Amino acid sequence: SQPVFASPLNVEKRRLNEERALMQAQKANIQLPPNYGDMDLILFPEGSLKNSNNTVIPQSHLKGKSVALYFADGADPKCASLLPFLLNYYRTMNEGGANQKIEIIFVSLDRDREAFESHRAHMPWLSIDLENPLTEILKRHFRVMKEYEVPTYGYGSRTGVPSVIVIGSDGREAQFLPICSGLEEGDRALLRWDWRNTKFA
Amino acid sequence: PPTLPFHGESAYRTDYVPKPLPEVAKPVEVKLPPTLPFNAQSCYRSEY
Prior knowledge:
With 201 residues, chain A is an alpha/beta fold.
């Protein structure tokens, strides 16, 4: 139940987890519904993530990587200003070590396929297919929108496009990178990344 | 007009999550030195 309770990823996770828990219940004192920490899920399906060479990788490839989703728009001037800074942070931060440190997945708020692909040609990190519903599920899960189109359920718009969200293995909001938030640090909030403390395990 | 939905989470709501408990299991295992066996071997049996 993190960051929220009313999100499609959370409700699907709850359905699958307590379906499995009930199944083991009549197969066998067990606790119903299961505790959120006991609950486990697959955050990205088999054919979701795609790299710069258009080859799919599974979720197990993100292990040991401080991974962050990047909600972005091709035509948005904040995203156009932010993208070289995020690019150079990824570049330098990954170059300067004997180990992979940070990794970025790209979630698109862009209007259509051609502009999404033209935007994706500039990003050197992983991305999610636009017609994959996982983008909409992640947008509703982490409460990001340009404008109120999908109804939030008494919750808030946690961030506007663009945003960088450090995530966990179970969809936990590990930390917020305050590019457009109540703190408003444009292009230098990226340095608040505690990549030592947060790793995709 | 839409309603700007309230994003907000206080200090008391944000900045601590339940930590894992510290892993402590270590006593002070001291190997006892064996009592050094005693011959300040006494007078009667010692000389006569």
